[PDB]
Write a protein that binds this ligand. Structure first.
Ligand SMILES: [Mg+2]
Ligand SMILES: [Mg+2]
Lengths: 348, 348
């Protein structure tokens, strides 16, 4: 595929590295630092490498109009949901310390100028930009000016619209990833369109490519790895009985571990070339390929033909099945017994 | 990808159809028709559509040399294994009837001229050709002359070598599939090279493409489906504690069902295009996209600038974030309150 790569802290990402699973706790903590810690613990104990937050400062994120619009996966205004689940600056700092105290990488998605500036003050190692902000060129300009790598979700946006955000990122000179994404909560399998990842890599040859997913299980992400994806993001919860509008499409510790194991296998199995010679097949080639044999008793002086020659395993005969027709018309230099492999000494 | 398709009996196969899982009982029955029936039952009860056999007539399959060569996954000669597990013509006919009595499709792999002729007499709906015979051009010629579709495994062979077999198949005028395959029992993940499927489809645009697999689990096949594969073949057993050299890489009823369910999800999720507009994202676009707002109180007559304008959710404002910079230099036609969306009536 490609050899693009960059570092998030000490963790390299890209086609030639192990796929990175981003555990998006998001708003799943419902505004409780204690709940967030329980989810951070569950992620740690499951083997997570990265916990991602969402940084919500509602007054800079939304105008008063947001109090009258309802998301497809809720029954109250987006403003109410965000004001309910937002952690304040003091608590988010503690959350980052807690994640890092567990040896994991902390990143977050700013949904506003104020949030981006908060995260720059905390000095996070990379920035996630959500699909809603993929076309927020002013906010992308700000985040790119921080000089850290950017992971950009691309849901709800065309290649043409994405080109403008990538132009800004390239101008700031930071490496970046593009996550294919579909922003329906939850997303039907039929809307995932894994082919969109190929479209992104074709259009943006310098991007690390991955998938942000909101389906009900791991299949989409496993397919993303088979296609060459390097970053996988799903929401994460410690328990599936938690309340919250994103819980239903979340992984838990057990399904995280399943994704991690499947991503490892598919990282190994993906790519490569048909024509590569595999040493381990040699014993099979040696017995499974066919050699030319006599199909009847052939007397000295008789001509070899398609009527007195055939081919049978194994592959150690003087003439392989690929040389079958070249023997036609040759002269038997001695009697040849039916069923015997044709020897170089059998022909004149 | 493509719209190639053909019928195996009443079952259409190809990119636009449900992936077909071939339950390869093979030599797993260890020569016992009773055992083969138990495996056919297990496949039926698990939901299998196709049971595939192997047709071994050892005298036409192997010369005496085969009694001295040992496969990588056994400790006796290939001749001994095949003579031990082969079903005679009477038993194979009963096996085909039994499979069909269960509503499933019966196909088989001939390893010899005599076996191919036996299967033509039984009138099977399609022929599998194993990777060992992919370069057995004489045998392919014979099988292609039967006028039934061919499913050709391509392990241990180059594209160049495969082109000669496909030429023969095309000349006979039958539709065909190409299964990418690696013939190590079992196959390490790192040797699967799922990219080989892309190589085959590029070289042979008229082929239905799939995977024949000998890994220890379903990951390779699930990746094959994500990449567009239409046919999946794994060995199949009723129970994993059965003896036999291929049992260890076999699926059983539970892992068959898991593959069937994963292949369904990935058939739905695969392919497609990034730029497709998804109706279900519309509610999210409506609240998640940003509109232009006043970043400070702006007095009538003042000019709009990057210093007194910003952007915030939701997306119902008169000016979207993509129009942000076009407002620069416009004149406020009235006082504009900090935080308000910019209205078309706010500018001269
Ligand atoms: Mg999300
Ligand atoms: Mg096999």
């Amino acid at each position: 595929q490609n050899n693009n790569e960059f570092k998030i802290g000490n963790r390299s990402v890209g086609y030639n590295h192990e796929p990175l699973i981003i555990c998006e706790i998001g708003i799943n903590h419902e505004g409780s630092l204690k709940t967030a810690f329980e989810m951070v613990d569950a992620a740690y104990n499951a083997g997570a490498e990265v916990v991602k937050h969402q940084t919500h400062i509602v007054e800079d994120e939304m105008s008063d109009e947001a109090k009258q619009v309802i998301p497809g996966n809720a029954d109250v205004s987006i403003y109410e949901i965000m004001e309910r689940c937002a952690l304040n600056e003091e608590d988010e700092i503690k959350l980052k310390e807690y994640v890092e105290s567990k040896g994991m990488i902390f990143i977050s998605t700013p949904f506003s100028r104020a949030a981006a500036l908060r995260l720059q003050r905390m000095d996070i190692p990379a920035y996630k930009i959500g699909s809603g902000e993929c076309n927020n060129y002013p906010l992308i300009k700000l985040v790119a000016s921080f000089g850290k790598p950017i992971i950009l979700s691309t849901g709800m946006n065309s290649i043409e619209s994405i080109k403008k955000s990538v132009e800004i990122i390239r101008e700031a000179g930071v490496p970046y990833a593009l996550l294919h994404c579909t922003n329906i909560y939850p997303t039907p399998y039929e809307d995932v369109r894994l082919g969109g990842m190929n479209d992104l890599s074709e259009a943006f040859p310098d991007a690390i490519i991955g998938l942000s997913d909101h389906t009900l299980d791991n299949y989409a992400c496993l397919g993303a790895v088979a296609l060459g994806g390097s970053i996988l993001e799903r929401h994460f919860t410690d328990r599936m009985d938690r309340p919250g509008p994103d819980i239903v499409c979340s992984m838990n510790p057990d399904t995280f571990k399943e994704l991690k194991q499947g991503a490892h296998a598919l990282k190994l199995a993906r790519g490569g070339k048909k024509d590569t010679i595999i040493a381990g097949e040699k014993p099979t080639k040696d017995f499974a390929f066919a050699s030319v044999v006599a199909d009847k008793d052939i007397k000295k002086g008789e001509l070899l033909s398609g009527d007195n020659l055939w081919v049978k395993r194994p592959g150690n005969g003087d003439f392989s099945v690929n040389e079958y027709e070249t023997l036609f018309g040759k002269v038997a230099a001695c009697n040849i017994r039916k069923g015997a492999q044709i020897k170089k000494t059998d022909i004149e």
